[PDB]
Amino acid sequence: HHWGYGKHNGPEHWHKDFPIAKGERQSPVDIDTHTAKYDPSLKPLSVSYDQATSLRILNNGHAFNVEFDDSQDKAVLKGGPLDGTYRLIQFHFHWGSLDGQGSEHTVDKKKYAAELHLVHWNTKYGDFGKAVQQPDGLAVLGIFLKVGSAKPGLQKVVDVLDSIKTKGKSADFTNFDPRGLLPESLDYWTYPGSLTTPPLLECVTWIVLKEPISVSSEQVLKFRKLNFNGEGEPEELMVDNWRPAQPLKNRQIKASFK
Numbered sequence: 696h697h698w699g700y701g702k703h704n705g706p707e708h709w710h711k712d713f714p715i716a717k718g719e720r721q722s723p724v725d726i727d728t729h730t731a732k733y734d735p736s737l738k739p740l741s742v743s744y745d746q747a748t749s750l751r752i753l754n755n756g757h758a759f760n761v762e763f764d765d766s767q768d769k770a771v772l773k774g775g776p777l778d779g780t781y782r783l784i785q786f787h788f789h790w791g792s793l794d795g796q797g798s799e800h801t802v803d804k805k806k807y808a809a810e811l812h813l814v815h816w817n818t819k820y821g822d823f824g825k826a827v828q829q830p831d832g833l834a835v836l837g838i839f840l841k842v843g844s845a846k847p848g849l850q851k852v853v854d855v856l857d858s859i860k861t862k863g864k865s866a867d868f869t870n871f872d873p874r875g876l877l878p879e880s881l882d883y884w885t886y887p888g889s890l891t892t893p894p895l896l897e898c899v900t901w902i903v904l905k906e907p908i909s910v911s912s913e914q915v916l917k918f919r920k921l922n923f924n925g926e927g928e929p930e931e932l933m934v935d936n937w938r939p940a941q942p943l944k945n946r947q948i949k950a951s952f953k
């Protein structure tokens with residue numbers, strides 16, 4: 696066995712191996728724009744990716760991760776609801792089999808075609824492994840993707856996917872600039888949550904941007920050519936690798952705007 700997104704190992708099954716799946720601060724969640732409240736206590740959000748150093752791209756059987764060198768303070772996220780410095784370690788996406796679904800977070804129940812997750816760990820914990828043992832160990836910047844005009848900055852990623860079609864495959868991926876995946880506005884919603892895939896640890900401060908980026912149908916279609924399976928195994932297209940919205944419970948989503 697092994698958790699996945701299928702009928703017999705999907706999200707509704709995760710709680711068995713990972714009881715925290717029914718926890719008090721699970722992600723993703725639906726973002727009710729009318730209930731979210733503007734928070735003046737939020738400081739300006741700062742995304743500094745100018746010195747970002749990508750190293751490799753990997754198909755881990757659930758999605759593909761563009762990994763970065765986080766041995767030094769380069770690509771960092773700070774400000775907003777965050778206290779201290781968070782360092783970028785990797786980014787990945789969640790997408791659907793159709794344009795009408797694919798995102799994990801939803802806005803007023805609306806599902807986007809995909810969602811980009813830029814993962815960062817709190818530098819005061821030394822490293823990622825230690826950060827995931829803390830309630831404020833991680834910060835994930837989420838960006839929605841809608842199908843429309845192509846996103847130039849994403850093409851380098853889509854063009855390397857052919858080399859990592861199956862689970863376990865990786866490829867060198869240096870000099871990729873994540874700044875090319877950001878929308879114009881940094882307006883966002885924020886709330887305390889968790890990792891959206893096992894181990895589903897509740898160590899994440901979520902920062903979801905309001906403005907989605909546009910990607911072309913051609914670009915997302917290539918995402919859908921990836922495989923969940925390993926080389927030589929029966930083909931199971933990597934699509935719908937998203938977890939649905941979870942109970943908000945005792946939480947309040949704050950807005951950085953209006």
Ligand SMILES: CCOc1ccc2nc(S(N)(=O)=O)sc2c1
Nearest residue numbers: 812814835889890891892893894
């Ligand atoms: C220790 C294994 O590393 C992990 C495991 C799950 C996980 N989920 C996310 S997400 N979808 O951004 O909430 S990033 C991440 C890193």
Ligand SMILES: [Cl-]
Nearest residue numbers: 700701702931
């Ligand atoms: Cl299936």
Ligand SMILES: [Zn+2]
Nearest residue numbers: 787789812891
């Ligand atoms: Zn994710």
